[PDB]
Design an enzyme around this catalytic site. Structure first.
Site, short mmCIF file in Angstrom:
data_model
loop_
_atom_site.label_atom_id
_atom_site.label_comp_id
_atom_site.label_asym_id
_atom_site.label_seq_id
_atom_site.Cartn_x
_atom_site.Cartn_y
_atom_site.Cartn_z
N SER A 1 0.91 -1.15 -0.04
CA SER A 1 -0.03 -0.44 0.22
C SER A 1 0.68 0.96 0.40
O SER A 1 1.59 1.51 0.47
CB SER A 1 -0.98 0.16 1.27
OG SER A 1 -1.48 -1.60 1.02
N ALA B 1 -0.35 -0.83 5.68
CA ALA B 1 -0.22 -1.75 6.79
C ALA B 1 1.29 -0.83 7.35
O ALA B 1 1.89 -0.65 7.12
CB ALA B 1 -0.07 -2.40 5.78
N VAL C 1 3.77 -9.08 17.78
CA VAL C 1 3.77 -10.70 18.01
C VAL C 1 4.56 -10.95 18.64
O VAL C 1 5.35 -10.83 17.56
CB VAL C 1 2.70 -11.04 16.61
CG1 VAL C 1 2.15 -12.76 17.03
CG2 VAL C 1 1.35 -9.94 16.25
N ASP C 2 4.78 -12.02 19.39
CA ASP C 2 5.90 -12.50 19.94
C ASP C 2 5.03 -13.67 20.61
O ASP C 2 3.56 -13.60 20.52
CB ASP C 2 7.12 -12.24 21.31
CG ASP C 2 7.32 -11.02 20.95
OD1 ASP C 2 7.50 -10.13 19.71
OD2 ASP C 2 7.19 -10.09 22.05
N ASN D 1 4.85 1.24 2.79
CA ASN D 1 5.07 -0.10 3.59
C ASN D 1 6.44 -0.59 4.04
O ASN D 1 7.04 -1.53 4.61
CB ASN D 1 4.66 -1.48 3.35
CG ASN D 1 3.17 -1.63 2.71
OD1 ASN D 1 2.87 -2.08 2.14
ND2 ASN D 1 2.32 -1.39 3.65
N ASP E 1 9.42 -9.25 12.25
CA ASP E 1 9.35 -10.41 12.84
C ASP E 1 9.75 -11.14 11.30
O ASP E 1 10.52 -12.38 11.34
CB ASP E 1 9.71 -11.37 14.33
CG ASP E 1 8.08 -12.20 14.28
OD1 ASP E 1 8.14 -13.01 13.34
OD2 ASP E 1 8.03 -12.12 15.29
O1 LIG Z 1 -1.07 -2.06 3.22
C1 LIG Z 1 -1.30 -2.86 3.62
O2 LIG Z 1 -0.89 -4.05 3.71
C2 LIG Z 1 -2.85 -3.04 2.97
C3 LIG Z 1 -3.45 -1.64 3.79
C4 LIG Z 1 -3.81 -0.30 3.59
C5 LIG Z 1 -4.46 0.13 4.79
C6 LIG Z 1 -3.90 -0.14 6.15
C7 LIG Z 1 -4.19 -1.96 6.63
C8 LIG Z 1 -3.79 -2.67 4.83
CA LIG Z 2 8.04 -10.85 17.38
#
Ligand SMILES: O=C(O)Cc1ccccc1
Ligand SMILES: [Ca+2]
Lengths: 193, 557
Positions: free
Chosen positions: B1, B69, B75-76, B241, B252
């Site tokens: 994104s 995103a 998350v662990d 991203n 991770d």
């Molecule tokens: O970036 C991504 O994978 C898709 C996305 C866009 C906006 C919010 C969550 C995920």
């Molecule tokens: Ca982790």
């Protein structure tokens, strides 16, 4: 009026909701969604709760089990139960709105039922606030914020240690899966922070 | 994104410009849903995934918002200690604690039903258990128990009228997501939102920790710690991203890295290029980045240096000259099936060969398969999501940087050979492979173009439409599932805000029982393909002015 919900669609079919309170506003939203995207929403509800094998069969049992093992339904209900009445209205308004339109569809299926319910051989059920919450939880929290490969990383690291020995195995791990890389292009400039 | 936000100082004929291209795959009916809400303190327009109560993309006439995103590590995994005797118990803070469990029955259309148990500990649901170690893995999420609050923060933010109010909501969104802001005054902002653990000292977040007690998170980090910028010195905000900020640790995932090779650079190049950008220019960046080869920029210098002392009659040199002559923008030929230049095909074969000789060779099987992809994936339906630089490719870039790379090279990936010799060997492989299929005349190579498919199955692989409802676009475009643009204080209008979007195939997925398709089932499909857009209405007069129908309901709770 407070009982009144006006729905205006534009030249692309995009709905606009005019309402005086929260419950009426989300009811309007719920209603147009059931008009436009009922099969999609219904399949999205079964996907996020792991109920696809019921209508689709044998092939989705593993999928259904994997979805159910990745959440705790009771923890979600407890968060709903703790909402304030204004917050709760959003979710209730929405589910009620949808239900209003599912009742007409189920009443006059010779003209209102989405063709795919006939194809797939089943019919729409009524929604509750838990169902609306699960749409967001299942497609936003699990698909974009539930990422880990830690068990796999450990497996890799173990194999690098039996190849290069213990200290070496670890330094190669840091070359392949570094924690940070100071040359990575960033959204915030270094002068900023 | 991706996202690009342009402030006062970079905007031309406007005060602020927001362009968003959330990437979630391509689906029929549309992934997102267009909706305007007017009443109960809300006055918004936009579109949002799965018609969630809160609009991920849109504006309220004062502020505009968007998302990408985040990919932070939230998350662990906790390695839970089980006893062979006393089952369904685990050791925690020197006591044998009992697990939460629940039975589940899977009902199956035309088959027997199936029941199983789900287990949970203080750390999270159990993923897997190793009864040989007497270890069970629990997946611990920093947002556990804030799922509902995240939804509501996404809803309440639609009512904010400034940065101050907006960030009070950003502080409650607990998933790892980038949030973006723009306003009528030209102000722009960014927040890397989410709940992150306050880990115990010496906790390596890439690997599991014992769940017996000492390794338990201390809590969650405060929101003051979340990367954020308001009115940046550059005049813009870009993201694809990539890392939010210097030294911020990524997810991770073995397959996910933030390194010197990053596709966000492709956006930055274009935004720094022009001192000011207009809305058409800001929109236009979608077309360029949609078509841009992501590897050209990273390895062209490397290929140039290696073939510099070669002869013109040398085929390995010819291949590099083809690439030198190319801008990296893929265009379809008149046939609607092949690309104009063979560049991507060359880089794809070269890169695969390079990975097999370097990164793949250094990793034990079967971990070697994780680093062999070149990033040119696809099938007949084309890519399922966005095009990116593969993990193997990001690791090879650091290696070809030698000593300019901050990543210590514990193993020499070139295994004692000079770089140039490995590069030329891969180039020989390339030529041998491609010349065999297309012939010797590089100028008449007609390489296959990637295509775009609007799938009938949702991202879980579950049907959300009939198979026949699947749509095909000839040209693969590395862009949002939807694209939306918000322009504040156009100098061009009387309107304080202008907004546009595209929701393909259309607004409605309705098909009547007789097979009669809605009027709005696919009226946005062609607009999508040629980089077009439709006006988003906010005010009553615009909505009235453009109405096609009205429905009034009288309901009481
Ligand atoms: O970036 C991504 O994978 C898709 C996305 C866009 C906006 C919010 C969550 C995920
Ligand atoms: Ca982790």
């Amino acid at each position: 009026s407070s009982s009144e919900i006006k729905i205006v669609r534009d030249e692309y079919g995009m709905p606009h909701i005019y309402a005086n309170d929260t419950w009426h506003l989300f009811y309007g939203y719920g209603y147009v969604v059931a008009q436009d995207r009922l099969f999609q929403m219904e399949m999205a509800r079964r996907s996020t709760q792991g109920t696809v094998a019921e209508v689709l069969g044998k092939d989705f049992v593993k999928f259904d089990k994997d979805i159910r093992r990745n959440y705790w339904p009771d923890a979600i209900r407890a968060q709903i139960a703790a909402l304030s009445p204004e917050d709760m209205s959003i979710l209730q308004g929405y589910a009620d709105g949808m239900n209003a339109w599912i009742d007409k569809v189920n009443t006059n299926p010779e003209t209102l039922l989405p063709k795919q319910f006939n194809t797939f051989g089943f019919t729409p059920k009524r929604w509750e606030p838990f169902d609306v919450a699960m749409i967001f939880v299942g497609t936003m929290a699990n698909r974009f914020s539930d990422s880990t490969s830690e068990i796999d990383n450990l497996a890799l690291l173990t194999a690098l240690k039996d190849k290069y020995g213990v200290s070496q195995g670890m330094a190669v791990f840091n070359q392949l899966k570094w924690l940070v890389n100071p040359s990575a292009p960033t959204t915030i400039a270094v002068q900023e922070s | 994104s991706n996202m690009w936000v342009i402030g006062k100082s970079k905007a031309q004929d406007a005060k602020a410009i927001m362009v968003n291209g959330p990437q979630f795959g391509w689906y029929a009916p549309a992934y997102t849903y267009g909706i305007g809400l007017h009443g109960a303190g809300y006055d918004v327009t936009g579109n949002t995934p799965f018609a969630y109560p809160g609009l991920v993309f849109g504006h309220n006439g004062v502020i505009s918002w968007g998302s990408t995103a985040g990919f932070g590590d939230d998350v662990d995994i906790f390695a839970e200690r089980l006893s062979a005797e006393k089952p369904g118990y685990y050791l925690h803070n020197g006591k044998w604690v009992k697990m939460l469990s629940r039975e589940e029955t899977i009902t199956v259309k035309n088959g027997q039903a199936e029941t199983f148990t789900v287990w949970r500990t203080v750390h999270g649901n159990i993923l897997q258990t190793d009864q040989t170690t007497q270890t069970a893995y629990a997946k611990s999420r920093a947002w556990d128990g804030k799922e509902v609050a995240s939804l509501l923060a996404w809803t309440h933010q639609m009512k904010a009228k400034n940065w101050q109010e907006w960030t009070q909501q950003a502080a409650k969104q607990a998933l790892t997501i980038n949030w973006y802001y723009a306003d009528v005054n030209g102000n722009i902002g960014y927040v890397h939102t989410g709940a992150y653990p306050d880990r115990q000292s010496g906790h390596d977040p890439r690997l599991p920790v014992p769940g017996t007690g000492k390794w338990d998170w201390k809590g969650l980090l405060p929101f003051e710690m979340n990367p954020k910028v308001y009115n940046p010195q550059s005049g813009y905000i870009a993201n694809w991203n990539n890392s939010p900020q210097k030294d911020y640790p990524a997810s991770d995932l073995f397959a996910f890295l933030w390194g010197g090779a990053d596709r966000v650079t492709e956006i930055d190049r274009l935004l720094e290029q022009k001192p000011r950008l207009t809305a058409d220019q800001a929109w236009d960046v979608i077309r360029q980045t949609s078509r841009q080869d992501l590897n050209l920029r990273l390895f062209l210098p490397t290929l140039q240096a290696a073939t510099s002392g070669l002869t013109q009659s040398d085929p390995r040199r010819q291949l590099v000259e083809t690439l030198t002559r190319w801008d990296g923008i893929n265009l379809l030929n008149d046939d609607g099936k092949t690309w104009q230049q063979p560049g991507s095909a060359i880089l794809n074969v070269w890169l695969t060969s390079m990975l097999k000789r370097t990164v793949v060779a250094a990793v034990p099987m079967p971990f070697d398969k994780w680093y062999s992809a070149s990033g040119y994936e696809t099938t007949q339906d084309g890519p399922t999501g966005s095009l990116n630089i593969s993990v193997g490719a990001k690791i090879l870039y650091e290696a070809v940087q030698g000593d300019k790379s901050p990543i210590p090279q514990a193993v020499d990936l070139f295994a004692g050979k000079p770089q140039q010799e490995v590069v030329l060997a891969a180039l020989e492989d390339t030529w041998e492979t491609l010349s065999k299929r297309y012939g010797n005349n590089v100028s008449n190579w007609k390489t296959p173009a990637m295509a775009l498919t609007f799938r009938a199955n949702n991202f879980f692989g579950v049907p959300q439409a009939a198979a026949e409802e699947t749509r095909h676009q000839a040209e693969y475009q590395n862009r949002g599932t939807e694209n939306d643009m918000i322009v504040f204080s156009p100098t061009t209008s009387d309107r304080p805000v202008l907004a546009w979007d595209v929701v393909a195939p259309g607004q409605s997925g309705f098909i009547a029982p007789d097979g009669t398709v809605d009027k709005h089932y696919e009226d946005q499909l062609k607009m999508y393909e040629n980089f077009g857009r439709k006006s988003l209405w906010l005010t009553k007069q615009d909505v009235e002015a453009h109405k096609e129908s009205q429905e009034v309901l009288h309901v009481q709770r």
